[PDB]
Symmetry: C3
Subunit: 335 residues, 3 copies
């Protein structure tokens, strides 16, 4: 169909780690699904010792919100760059075809907005990110990325075509940060975004992140902000990394079905311990919880997780199952 | 079945690179398979110039021994932490479900042991590793990991369901080491394990290994300690990397059938030149030798292999096959 | 068949990024396909500020030329090392079986040549590279690698066995460079290849490239040297990385069908945003262009691409398609 003649619907986005309400399988025909995002440059505290990042975001969060459509829908995004920001921005959708993913059609200076439509003709999770000419990696590593999820119209399927369903989706964006230090060995704090640029590029070129965080900060997805589930619930874990490889893992769980390259027309793999999200992509894993307790969800380069920040928690309620795991003898003196 | 009512068998572990005797396909029903491992902290010489590592091991080796069961069996491990060690330890099994892979149920201080049971309900090679709260990557990178192999009850299969069989299994654990240097440019030698901690964490956070070794040392799997095979023999090469990505390769061979994500319910890929083991996982490759000679088996980041240590040898006996490869003209002056 | 009795054909190689003319599906039976390559050591300017590399090449280019045969053919390569070079060289073919991929049979000192035959019995793209004993990574990272493509005799196929065809093939070799700096912070320029060795090994061991280039230089595949296509044309993008992982991506496009591990007997994946070439391998992607414009083809570690060099351009002619993408509202003041 011709999109100019199709029904339009508007979606209200929600902040990560939640994902806006949506259908999996749907009886709906194709639609033009309208979204708006407003860019916010802001200084953020990214660790427990007061380190700040001169950050750049879609909609005020790292990652930006996840946008969900169905295959054959059109995405119609209005991108707003308020006059309170300093930099130009745009958006590149890996789910889109042409014009550098839309970036060439969405260059907005502070004070401007633009509206892009594209056909979401390929199913999968896809990164979107800012990509202004001449300063692409800086905008990405400063926070400007998120996920577009294009569901098959009949929902997710296993390799034999059997339906897969989730009860809850969570979106995790993983951010390799390049925060400069000064000659005193302390992280720098900058009064403006522009002042951070040159020093940050030098750190970037070392390819060594200072921090690697989920969802904007060390510990973002812990404590009151842990992810939650129950025994018996199936969760979809969407993982985006717009710049650098990562290897997600659920400690004490598995990826029951995983699309690590993130593209739902391909059969998923089962029983994964650790999967691989290529830098510049989003992938997705399903898991049905079978044990209660506090899980970790992390990048299984354990230095990247525990030393640099790429780890969160999932608090799961329900009944312990001694068939799956039992302590036969508790720690006690060696006989 | 209820594991409390199933038959128990005990397995005697063997040191890497061998793997304890086991069946592939079996007529046996599910069993509770009992293993014991004893933690040994020890100083190890890890290269040819006398560099030492304040190491931590399961059963005295890097990697720990490979444990082999069949899908539907239960693993029942007694983990012993003698009083001669300095640190607490535990074990996390990626093949297990719940309680942080078992780590929460196996915290043993020096002088203690504990016994864990879990259902091995998913086929594949899976990493196990130590994970004590607050010092997880240090224990892993100091040597505390190995593989659990859960074979399908009817043995390995190709993508069409045809049986695959191996004559010999070898287990290779690859270890990214973070050995500190002092201000004189020499690697540090520490009198105790605890004294090594702070300096090692700083090196870890650079994400640059000093050494990357197979099986505990540069050259571990070379010379008298080369792996061996014959023309016509099919070998299974199990490769674990509990912390960091690697890319195994057999020079002059291939991965005939490879499960790079390591999970046997998924179809393997064929004819691989180089495969990919995500940090935090174990994978497996089958190869049937067709030529004699000394092969290298290595990580094909060739700097990681030849400069940092991640390479071994396979000495293969038998008859050379000029159909597969022939020197037509030996090196000689250019006409 | 016995290769000694088969027909021989000679192929004239062409420089990257082109690939010599070849059939996809063929009615031909197996042949011994003869190639010659001549090693050239030379100083190359690799960036826009005059940095030089003491380089090493097959046939004068980075990468070496792509060699194309069909499964069941034999490759018969004459490798020539002129007396004007300083170092010994050889060749290792990942597509070959035995004798360290051929390296043991092709050790040529300056002034020598050798001829190797092997059976190309496995379909796929495969790296070939130099591997002289004791200095393997140096020769690889200095430029000595390329691709052997072994096509199935009936051409490429999708997961259901349907024929896939390309109109044009391009070959991209990605090179992680390790150029030393002196104490003044400037890149070193060396009068000879041998003088560069020790300093380069120290940089290599940091695992941090100074530059990461396609096809020999920052910007090699841009401007007059951009890749070209038209709307409606299907291109095969061959990507080799003999030493280090990379993650190819076509901005504004996709991998329609991708063999990221590069082995054509395995089913390809569809709709990829970003794929993964393991260090030590070659992979291949098909894409049919649907929009005109200047695309980027890059490594989607965006620092590696935009800061270090791993990016090129594809200039595509034809008609813009507003169904796939349309600017609904151009950048304008915020209402
Ligand atoms: Cu931006
Ligand atoms: Cu992108
Ligand atoms: Cu431990
Ligand atoms: Cu783990
Ligand atoms: Cu060479
Ligand atoms: Cu190689």
């Amino acid at each position: 169909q011709d999109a100019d003649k199709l029904p339009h619907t508007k979606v209200t986005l929600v902040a990560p780690p939640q994902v806006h309400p949506h259908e999996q399988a749907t009886k709906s025909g194709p639609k033009v699904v309208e979204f708006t995002m407003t860019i916010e440059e802001k200084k953020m505290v990214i660790d427990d010792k007061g380190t700040t990042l001169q950050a750049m975001t879609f909609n005020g969060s790292m990652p930006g919100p996840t946008l969900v459509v169905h295959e054959g829908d059109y995405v119609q995004l209005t991108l707003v760059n308020p006059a309170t920001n300093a930099m130009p921005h745009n958006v590149e959708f890996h789910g889109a075809t042409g014009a550098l993913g839309g970036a060439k059609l969405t260059n907005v200076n502070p004070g401007e907005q633009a509206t892009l439509r594209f056909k979401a003709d390929r199913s999968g999770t896809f990164v979107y990110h800012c990509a202004p000419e001449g300063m692409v990696p800086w905008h990405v590593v400063s926070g400007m990325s998120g996920t577009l999820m294009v569901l098959p119209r009949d929902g997710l399927k296993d390799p034999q075509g059997k339906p897969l369903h989730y009860d809850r989706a969570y979106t995790i964006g993983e951010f390799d940060l390049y925060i400069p230090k000064g000659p005193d060995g302390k992280y720098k704090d900058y009064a403006t975004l522009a002042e951070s640029y040159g020093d940050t590029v030098q750190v970037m070129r070392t390819l060594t992140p200072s921090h690697i965080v989920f969802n904007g900060k060390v510990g973002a997805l812990t404590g009151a902000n842990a992810l939650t589930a129950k025994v018996g619930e199936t969760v979809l874990l969407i993982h985006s990394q717009a710049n650098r490889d990562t290897r997600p893992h659920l400690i004490g769980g598995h990826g029951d079905w995983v699309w690590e390259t993130g593209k739902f027309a391909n059969p998923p793999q089962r029983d994964l311990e650790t999967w691989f999200i290529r830098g510049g992509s989003a992938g997705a894993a399903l898991y049905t919880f079978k044990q209660p307790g506090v899980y970790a969800y992390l990048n299984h380069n354990l230095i990247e997780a525990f030393e640099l920040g790429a780890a969160g928690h999932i608090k799961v309620e329900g009944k312990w199952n001694d068939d799956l795991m039992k302590q036969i003898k508790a720690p006690a003196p060696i006989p």
